Structures are given as structure tokens and as C-alpha cells.
Paper text:
The ANKS3-SAM/ANKS6-SAM heterodimer crystallized in space group C2221 with four molecules (2 ANKS3-SAM I36E mutants and 2 ANKS6-SAMs) per asymmetric unit. Additionally, the overall structure of ANKS3-SAM I36E aligns well with ANKS6-SAM (RMSD across backbone atoms is 0.626 Å) with the only obvious difference being a 1.6 Å outward shift of ANKS6-SAM’s helix 3.Similar to the ML-surface of ANKS3-SAM, the ML-surface of ANKS6-SAM contains a shallow hydrophobic patch (residues V30, A34, L38, L46) flanked by negatively charged residues (E29, D31, E33, D42, E45). Many of these charged residues form salt bridges with ANKS3-SAM (ANKS6 E29 + ANKS3 K22, ANKS6 D31 + ANKS3 K58, ANKS6 D42 + ANKS3 R57). The decreased steric bulk of Ala compared to Ile allows helix 3 of ANKS6-SAM’s ML-surface to approach the EH-surface of ANKS3-SAM more closely, resulting in the burial of additional surface area and the formation of more salt bridges and hydrogen bonds, which may explain the higher affinity of the ANKS3-SAM/ANKS6-SAM interface. The ANKS6-SAM structure also shows that the EH-surface is lacking a large hydrophobic residue flanked by positively charged residues, thereby showing that ANKS6-SAM cannot polymerize because its EH-surface is incompatible with binding its ML-surface.
Recent work has revealed that ANKS6 interacts with a related protein called ANKS3. SAM domains consist of approximately 70 amino acids and adopt a globular structure generally containing a core of five α-helices.
Numbering used by the authors:
A (entry chain A): 3 to 66
B (entry chain C): 8 to 67
């Protein structure tokens, strides 16, 4: 259905061009539900250390 | 695109920051004064020019 949220974390990351980070999240057992609870510093702590991807992720989290 | 924006502002010296930090256009258009300081652009005038460019792009 159009304009619904991503079905899973891979879907979200694909949308924001961040699939290069999917396995980092998977290794920490972070699924979509947990991802949507993360703060900026949580993302940095997991290894999303670059400004661009971290910003696209915080934007996505706020969006969904 | 980004490299062209910086070129037109005569601020291509900052391109390596955006490239290494993987700042694409989507991310670039969200950048605030604080973000530019954090990225390392300490020169006030540089931030003023970049933010003005971002503002015009987001206008409307």
C-alpha cells in the first residue's frame, strides 16, 4: 500500500541508501522496532560515525 | 549537485569534508549552522554562504 512505512529495517535502510550499515545493526540484534527508538548518540555508538548516514537515519526515525 | 554548489560559492576547499562524511544532497539540505561547525567549517562567512545556498534551495 502506498505511503506506508518500511516493512523491516532492510527496507528502511534501502530507502535512505544506507544498506551498507544493515549488517552492523543485525549483529547488534537491532531490528526495525528497536531502530525507531534510537537516538543520534545511539547510532554513533553502534558505529554510524559519519555525519551523512547518521543524519539520514535520524531523519528517517523522526519520519516513521 | 553538491560539488557544483560549492564551486559556484568558490568554496570547493570544503568538498573533501562532505565527501568523507558521506553527505549527499538529502543530508546537505538539512544542515544547520551548528551542523556546519561540527563538520569543521569554523569560518563564519563560509557557513553564512553555505546556509544561504541551502535556504534558497529549500525555499517554497
Amino acid at each position: 500500500a502506498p505511503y506506508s512505512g518500511p516493512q523491516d529495517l532492510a527496507a528502511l535502510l534501502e530507502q535512505i541508501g544506507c544498506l551498507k550499515y544493515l549488517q552492523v545493526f543485525e549483529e547488534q540484534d537491532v531490528d526495525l522496532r528497536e531502530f525507531l527508538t534510537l537516538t543520534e548518540s545511539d547510532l554513533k555508538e553502534i558505529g554510524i560515525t559519519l555525519f551523512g548516514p547518521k543524519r539520514k537515519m535520524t531523519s528517517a526515525i523522526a519520519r516513521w | 549537485e553538491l560539488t557544483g554548489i560549492l564551486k559556484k560559492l568558490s568554496l570547493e576547499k570544503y568538498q573533501p569534508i562532505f565527501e568523507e562524511q558521506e553527505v549527499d544532497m538529502e543530508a546537505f539540505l538539512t544542515l544547520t549552522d551548528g551542523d556546519l561547525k561540527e563538520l569543521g567549517i569554523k569560518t563564519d562567512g563560509s557557513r553564512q554562504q553555505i546556509l544561504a545556498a541551502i535556504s534558497e534551495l529549500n525555499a517554497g
